Every structure is written in C-alpha cells, then in structure tokens.
Coordinates of N, CA and C in Angstrom, one line a residue:
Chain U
X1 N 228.3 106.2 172.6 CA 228.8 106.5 174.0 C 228.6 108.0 174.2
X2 N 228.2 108.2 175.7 CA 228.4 110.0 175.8 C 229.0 109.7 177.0
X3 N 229.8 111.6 176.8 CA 230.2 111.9 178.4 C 229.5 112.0 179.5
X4 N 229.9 112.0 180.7 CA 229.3 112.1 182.1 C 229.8 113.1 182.7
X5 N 231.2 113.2 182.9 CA 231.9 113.7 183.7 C 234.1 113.4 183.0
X6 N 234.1 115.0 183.7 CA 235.7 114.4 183.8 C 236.6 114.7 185.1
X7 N 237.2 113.1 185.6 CA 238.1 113.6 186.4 C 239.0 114.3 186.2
X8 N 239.9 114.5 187.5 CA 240.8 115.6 187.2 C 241.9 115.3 188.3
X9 N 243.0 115.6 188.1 CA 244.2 114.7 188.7 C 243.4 115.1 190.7
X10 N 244.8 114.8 190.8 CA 243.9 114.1 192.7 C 245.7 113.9 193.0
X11 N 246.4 115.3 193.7 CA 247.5 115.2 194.0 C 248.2 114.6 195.1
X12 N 249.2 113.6 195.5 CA 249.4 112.8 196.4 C 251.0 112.5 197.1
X13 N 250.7 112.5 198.2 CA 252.2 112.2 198.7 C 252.0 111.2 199.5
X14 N 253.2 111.0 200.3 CA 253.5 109.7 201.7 C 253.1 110.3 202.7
X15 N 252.1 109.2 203.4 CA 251.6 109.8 204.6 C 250.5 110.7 204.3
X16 N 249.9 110.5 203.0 CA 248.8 111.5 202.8 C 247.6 111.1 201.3
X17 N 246.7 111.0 201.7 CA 245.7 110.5 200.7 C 243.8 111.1 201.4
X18 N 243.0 110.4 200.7 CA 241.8 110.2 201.1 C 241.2 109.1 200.8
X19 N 240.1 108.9 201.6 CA 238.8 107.7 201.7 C 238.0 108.5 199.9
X20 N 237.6 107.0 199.9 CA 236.8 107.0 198.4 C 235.7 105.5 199.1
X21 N 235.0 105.6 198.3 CA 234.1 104.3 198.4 C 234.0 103.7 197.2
X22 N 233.8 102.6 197.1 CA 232.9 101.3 195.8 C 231.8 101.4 196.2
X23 N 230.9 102.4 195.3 CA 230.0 102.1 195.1 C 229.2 101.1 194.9
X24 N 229.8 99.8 193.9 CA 229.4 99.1 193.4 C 229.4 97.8 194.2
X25 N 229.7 98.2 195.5 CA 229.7 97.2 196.8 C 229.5 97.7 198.1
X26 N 230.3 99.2 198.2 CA 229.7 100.1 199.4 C 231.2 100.2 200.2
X27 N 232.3 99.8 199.5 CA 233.3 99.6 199.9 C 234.4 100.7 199.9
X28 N 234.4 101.3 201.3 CA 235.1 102.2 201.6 C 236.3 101.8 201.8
X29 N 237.5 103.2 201.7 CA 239.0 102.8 201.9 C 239.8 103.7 201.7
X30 N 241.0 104.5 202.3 CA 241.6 105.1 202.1 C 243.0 105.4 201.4
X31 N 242.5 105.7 200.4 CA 244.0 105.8 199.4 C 245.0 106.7 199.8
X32 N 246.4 106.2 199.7 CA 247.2 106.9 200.2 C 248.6 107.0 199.4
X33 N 249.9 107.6 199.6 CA 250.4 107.7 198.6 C 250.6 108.4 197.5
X34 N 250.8 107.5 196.6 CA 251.0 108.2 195.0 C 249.4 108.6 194.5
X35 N 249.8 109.6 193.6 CA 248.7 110.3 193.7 C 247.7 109.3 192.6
X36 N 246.5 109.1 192.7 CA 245.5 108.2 192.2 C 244.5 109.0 191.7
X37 N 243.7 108.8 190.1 CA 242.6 109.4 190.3 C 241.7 108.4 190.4
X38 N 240.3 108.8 190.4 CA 239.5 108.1 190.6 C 239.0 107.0 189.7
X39 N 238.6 105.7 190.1 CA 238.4 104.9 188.7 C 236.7 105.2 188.4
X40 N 236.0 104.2 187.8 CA 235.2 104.4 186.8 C 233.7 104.9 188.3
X41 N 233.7 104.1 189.5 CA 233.2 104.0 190.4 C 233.0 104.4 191.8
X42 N 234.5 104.4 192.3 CA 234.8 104.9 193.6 C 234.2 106.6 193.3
X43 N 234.0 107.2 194.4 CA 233.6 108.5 194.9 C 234.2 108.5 196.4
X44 N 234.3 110.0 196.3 CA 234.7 110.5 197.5 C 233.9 110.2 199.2
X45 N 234.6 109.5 200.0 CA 233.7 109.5 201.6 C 233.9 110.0 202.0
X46 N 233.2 110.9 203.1 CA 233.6 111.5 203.9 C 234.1 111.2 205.9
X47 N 234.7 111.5 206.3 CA 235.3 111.2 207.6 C 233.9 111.7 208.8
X48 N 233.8 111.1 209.8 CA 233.1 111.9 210.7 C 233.9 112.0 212.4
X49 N 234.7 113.1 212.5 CA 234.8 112.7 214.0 C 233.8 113.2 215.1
Chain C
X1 N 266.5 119.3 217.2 CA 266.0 118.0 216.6 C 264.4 117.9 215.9
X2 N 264.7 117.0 214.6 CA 263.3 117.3 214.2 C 262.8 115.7 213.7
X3 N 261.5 115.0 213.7 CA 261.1 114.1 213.4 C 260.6 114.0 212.1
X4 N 260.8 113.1 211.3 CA 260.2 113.3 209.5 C 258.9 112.1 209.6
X5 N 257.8 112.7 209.6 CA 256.8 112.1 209.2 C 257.0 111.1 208.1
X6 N 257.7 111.4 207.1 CA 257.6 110.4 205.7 C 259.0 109.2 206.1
X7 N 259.6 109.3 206.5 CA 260.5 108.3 207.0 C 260.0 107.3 208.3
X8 N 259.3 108.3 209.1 CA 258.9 107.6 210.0 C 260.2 107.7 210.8
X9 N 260.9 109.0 210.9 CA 262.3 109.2 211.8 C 263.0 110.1 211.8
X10 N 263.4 110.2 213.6 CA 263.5 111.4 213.7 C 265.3 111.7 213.8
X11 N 265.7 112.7 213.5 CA 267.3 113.1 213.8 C 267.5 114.4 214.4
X12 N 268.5 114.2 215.1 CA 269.3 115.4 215.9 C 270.2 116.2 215.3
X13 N 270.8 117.1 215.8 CA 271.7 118.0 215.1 C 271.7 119.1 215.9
X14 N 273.1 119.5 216.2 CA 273.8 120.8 216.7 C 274.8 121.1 216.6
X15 N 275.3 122.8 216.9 CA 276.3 122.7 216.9 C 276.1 124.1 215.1
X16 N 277.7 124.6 214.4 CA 277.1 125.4 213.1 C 277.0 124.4 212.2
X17 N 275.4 124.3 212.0 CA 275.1 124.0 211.1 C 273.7 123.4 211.0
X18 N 273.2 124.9 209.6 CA 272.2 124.9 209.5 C 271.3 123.5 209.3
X19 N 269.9 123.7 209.7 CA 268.8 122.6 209.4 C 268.2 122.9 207.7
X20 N 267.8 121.6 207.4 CA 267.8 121.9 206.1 C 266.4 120.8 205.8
X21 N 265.0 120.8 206.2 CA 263.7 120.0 206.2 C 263.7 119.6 204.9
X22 N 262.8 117.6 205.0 CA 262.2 117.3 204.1 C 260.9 117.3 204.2
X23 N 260.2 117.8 203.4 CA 258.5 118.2 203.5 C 258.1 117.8 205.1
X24 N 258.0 116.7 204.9 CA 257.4 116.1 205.8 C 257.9 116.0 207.6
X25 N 259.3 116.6 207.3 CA 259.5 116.6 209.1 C 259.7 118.0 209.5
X26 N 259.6 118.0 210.8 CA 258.8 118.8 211.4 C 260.0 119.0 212.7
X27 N 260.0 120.3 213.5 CA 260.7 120.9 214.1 C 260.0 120.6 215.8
X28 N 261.4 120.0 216.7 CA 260.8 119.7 217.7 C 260.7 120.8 219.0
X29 N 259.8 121.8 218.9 CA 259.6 123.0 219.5 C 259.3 122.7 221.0
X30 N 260.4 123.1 222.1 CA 260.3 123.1 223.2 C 260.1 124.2 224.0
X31 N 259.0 124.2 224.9 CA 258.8 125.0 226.0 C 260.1 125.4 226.7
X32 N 260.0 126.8 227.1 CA 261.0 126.6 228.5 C 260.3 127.3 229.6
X33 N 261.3 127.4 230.7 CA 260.7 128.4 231.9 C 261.4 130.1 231.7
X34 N 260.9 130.9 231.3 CA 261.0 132.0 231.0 C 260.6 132.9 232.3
X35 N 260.1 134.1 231.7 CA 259.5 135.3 232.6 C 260.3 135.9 233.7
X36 N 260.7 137.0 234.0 CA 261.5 137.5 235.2 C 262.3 137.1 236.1
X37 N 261.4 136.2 236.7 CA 262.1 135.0 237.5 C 261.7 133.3 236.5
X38 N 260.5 132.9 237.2 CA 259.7 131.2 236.6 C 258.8 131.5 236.0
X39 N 258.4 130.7 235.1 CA 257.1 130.6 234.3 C 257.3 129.3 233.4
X40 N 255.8 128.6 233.6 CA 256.3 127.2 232.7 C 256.5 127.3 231.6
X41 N 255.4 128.2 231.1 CA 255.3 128.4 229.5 C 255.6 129.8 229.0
X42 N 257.1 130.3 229.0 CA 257.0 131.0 228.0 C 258.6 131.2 227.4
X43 N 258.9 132.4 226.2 CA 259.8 131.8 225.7 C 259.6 130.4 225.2
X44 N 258.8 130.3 224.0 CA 259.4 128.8 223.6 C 260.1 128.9 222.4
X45 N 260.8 127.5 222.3 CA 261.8 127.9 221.3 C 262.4 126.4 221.1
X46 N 263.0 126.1 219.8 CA 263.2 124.5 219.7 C 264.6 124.7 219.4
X47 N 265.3 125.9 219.9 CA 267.0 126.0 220.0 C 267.4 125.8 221.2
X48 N 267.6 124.7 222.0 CA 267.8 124.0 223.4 C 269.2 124.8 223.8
X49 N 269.4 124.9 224.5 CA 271.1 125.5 224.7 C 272.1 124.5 225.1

C-alpha cells in the first residue's frame, strides 16, 4: 500500500457545514453539524450563486 | 431582544440585566428616527427605550 494524501480535521457546528460530492456516483450533499472529515471519496463542491 | 440561530429561537429581555449570547444568536439591532428633528435612518441601536 502507499500514501496519497492526508486529511485533516474539517471543524463543525449547528447550523453550519459544507457540500462534498461522491465521486463514485456524482452525488452531491451538504454536510452539516458535527464536524466530519472526509471519507475515502467524497471531495469538496462548490456552491454557485 | 436577540434570536439564536442554533435553537432556532428567539428571547427578550429588559430591564438590569446584562445579555449574555450563545454563539449562534444574534442581536436584534433597530433603526430609529434620529437627526435634529426626523430622519429614518439614524442612530441605530438595539437598546429600544
């Protein structure tokens, strides 16, 4: 096995989070809450207004 | 009076005795009519008399 990368905490409250996607489906969604890091797939989306 | 975003609720209070915020709520800042004589917007302030 080798490394790729390392996450790194991803701080979180109520009423406050961000969008990540599944890549492995394309499945966007906004996490929110307790603070979550990222799992093996999701990455960061971004918002457009 | 101030509204708490993380409760989802807002509370009042007057009279001595100080306000004391949880992260998340926020101070309900009102306009008044100020200036010389009238004016809509000045003096604002969220201490109502």
């Amino acid at each position: 096995v080798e490394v790729v990368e390392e996450r790194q905490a991803i701080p979180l409250d109520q009423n406050e989070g961000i969008y990540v996607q599944d890549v492995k489906t394309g499945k966007v969604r906004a996490v929110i809450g307790s603070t979550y890091m990222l799992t093996q797939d999701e990455v960061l989306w971004e918002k457009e207004l | 009076q101030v509204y708490d975003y993380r409760a989802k609720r807002a509370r009042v209070v007057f009279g001595p005795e100080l306000v004391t915020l949880d992260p998340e709520e926020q101070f309900t800042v009102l306009s008044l009519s100020a200036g010389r004589p009238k004016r809509p917007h000045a003096r604002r302030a969220l201490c109502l008399l």
